[PDB]
Design a binder for these strands. Sequence first.
RNA 1: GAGAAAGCUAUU
RNA 2: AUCUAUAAUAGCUUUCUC
Lengths: 237, 60, 45, 173, 133
Amino acid sequence: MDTFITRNFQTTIIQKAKNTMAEFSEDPELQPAMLFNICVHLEVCYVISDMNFLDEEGKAYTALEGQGKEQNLRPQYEVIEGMPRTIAWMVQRSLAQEHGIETPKYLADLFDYKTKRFIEVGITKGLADDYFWKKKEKLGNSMELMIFSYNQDYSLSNESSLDEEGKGRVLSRLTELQAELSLKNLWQVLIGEEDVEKGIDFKLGQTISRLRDISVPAGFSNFEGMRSYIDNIDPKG
Amino acid sequence: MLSNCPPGGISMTVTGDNTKWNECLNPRIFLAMTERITRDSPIWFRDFCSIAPVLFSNKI
Amino acid sequence: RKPVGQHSMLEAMAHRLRMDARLDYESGRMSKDDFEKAMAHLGEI
Amino acid sequence: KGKQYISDVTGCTMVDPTNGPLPEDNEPSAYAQLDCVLEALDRMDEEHPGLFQAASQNAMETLMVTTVDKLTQGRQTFDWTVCRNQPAATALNTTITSFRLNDLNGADKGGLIPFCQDIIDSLDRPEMTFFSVKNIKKKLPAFLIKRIPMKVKDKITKVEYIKRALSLNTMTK
Amino acid sequence: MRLDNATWGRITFGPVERVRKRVLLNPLTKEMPPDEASNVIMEILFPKEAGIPRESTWIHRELIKEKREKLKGTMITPIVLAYMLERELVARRRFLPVAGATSAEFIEMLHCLQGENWRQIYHPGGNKLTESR
RNA sequence: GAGAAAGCUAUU
RNA sequence: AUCUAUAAUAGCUUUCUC
Ligand SMILES: [Mg+2]
Ligand SMILES: [Mg+2]
C-alpha cells in the first residue's frame, strides 16, 4: 500500500499529496488510488518544471550537471498543484492579474512565462484525444492543458512548450515506474474502484459514554435503552 | 386569539412567569428532547446533540 | 475576510511574499540585487 | 425526592428528579415525567409536520460549515488551565495549546466537529499536560506585595481534568 | 443633499395607524445580497487574494471594473474603502413602524415623517425609481 | 470579580 | 411580493434564582 509510494516517492512529495487529500476531505487509508494519482501528477509536474530556466533577456534555456545556486534562482514553469487551495488561488490570481490575463474559473496546474499561459497537466489511460477534447469541453482554450497516458500516447496542446529531451525523460521515467509497480503486482490494487459512501466520523470514547449512561432519566440502565424507548414508544395518552 | 374566540363565549389572558425556571429544568429532560427531535438524523449528529445535556447533567 | 486554510501561517506568508517578489521583479519594480537578496532570504526560511 | 447516587466517573453526589414521584403540593417541582414530555413533543411534531427534520438538517449543515473561531465570540469564559476566568479567545487558545501538548490536533482541521472530537477524547486521557500561570511575589518596601506572572508546565490527572472541564465558574451579576 | 433639496408640507394632527414592516433603511445604488457584495468588494480591493471566481460575481463585472478604475491611486486604508463600498452596496432592512411611505428616501426621515397622532408631509430630493411610482 | 440568548445601534 | 442573504468588535435594552 504505502510502502511502494514511500520507497519510490520523496518525503516532501508524499507529504504534499497527503496534505492535498486532507484538504479534499477524504480518508487517506481506504483510497490509495487517489494518493498514487496525486503523487504521480505532482511528481511529473516537478520533472517538467526542473527542465527550463529563465535568463535576463526573457529566453528559456536548459541547465545540466555542474551548476550553482546563483545560476538557478528563478524557474521557468511555476507549479501550482500540490499547494493548498488558498495559496494556489492566490498564486493563480496574482499571475493572472499582474500579467493582464482573465483568471479562469478552475484552478490550473502550471503557469508558463514564455507564453504566459495556464496549463492543466493530466494523465489518463484511454484515448489521449478523447480525454483532451473532454477537458476542452468546459472552457475550450482558457488553459493550454496537456494530456499524457501510460501507453506512451499524449495529446499536447497547440502551445508547444516542451522539447524532445524532457518529454522522453518523462516518458522513460513513467515506463520505468509502471514496470516497477507491475512486477510488484499493484495494478489490481488501484484500478478496482472501491468507493463506499462516507460521512462524518464522530465516535464517543469511554468516559463520555459512561457519563451519558449515568445521565439518563431514572428508569433506564444505559443510553441505548433510553434511545430505543424514545424512538419506539408511542407516548399517547 | 381575539378573532377565533367562539361566539357567545369568554376569553381570558394569564400574564404569567415561571418561578425557579432554571433550578427546576433538568438536563436529562433536555437529553430526551434532543433524542426525540433528532429522530431522523444520522447517528453521529445524534451523538453530537446528546453530548451537551450529558455534560450539563454532570456539571460541577 | 477571515482567512481560511489548514496550513501554517509561516508557509502562507512565505508563498505570498515569494509571489509578490516574483511579480514585482517581472514588472520592473525591484532590481536584480535586491531580488537576489529577497530570494536568498526566502530560501533561508 | 428523586434518586440519589454517586457518580462513578467523578465521585460527586448526583440527584435525578426525572420520573420521580408526582408533586403533592404547589412548591417548585423538578420531577418531570418523561412520557409526558415525549407526548408534548409528539403533539408538536404532529401539528407541524417535518419541523424537527428540517431543524435537524439545518443544524447539521451549519455544524458542518462551522469553524473553531466561532468559539471566540463570547465574553469572560472559565479557563480550566488556570482555573480562572479569561476572555473567550484567550481561553480557546490556551485550550488549543494544551491539546497540542497532549497529542490532540483536532483544532488544526479548522472545523468544530474535529475540535469537539478532540475534546471528548481528552476526557479519556489519563493525564493532562498544559500551561498554567505562577505568580512570583515580592515584598516591596514602600510594605506591599508585587505579583509577576509567568507560564509554566503543569499536569493534572484524569479525574481532576474531568472535574475541571465540567466546572462552571460562578460570580455576581 | 436629499435632506437639503427637500420640501416640507403642512402638518396634520389626527390618528395615524402604523404597521411594523421590514423596510430598507437607506437608499442604495445597486442592492446586492451580502455574499455577492462581499465577493464584489473582494474583487475590487483585493483581487490577488480573492479565491475562486464565482459565476454570480461576473454578473456585476462592469461595475467592478468601474470601481477599480476609480481606486487606482487611492492611499486610503483598504478596510475603510471596503466598508465604504459595503455601505454603498449592501442593503440594511429592519422592522420599523411605518404609515404610507416605505421607500428608503422616506425611511431615512421616518422620525420626522409621523408619530401616533400627527403626520408631516415631506418631499425628499433626488430621483425616484419608476417602480415606486 | 462582571455569564447566556435575542433585538437594536455605532464602528472598522 | 424583502421573501434570501448577513464579517468581527463594542455599547444599550430585554429575559434568564428570591
Ligand atoms: Mg410575564
Ligand atoms: Mg422566572
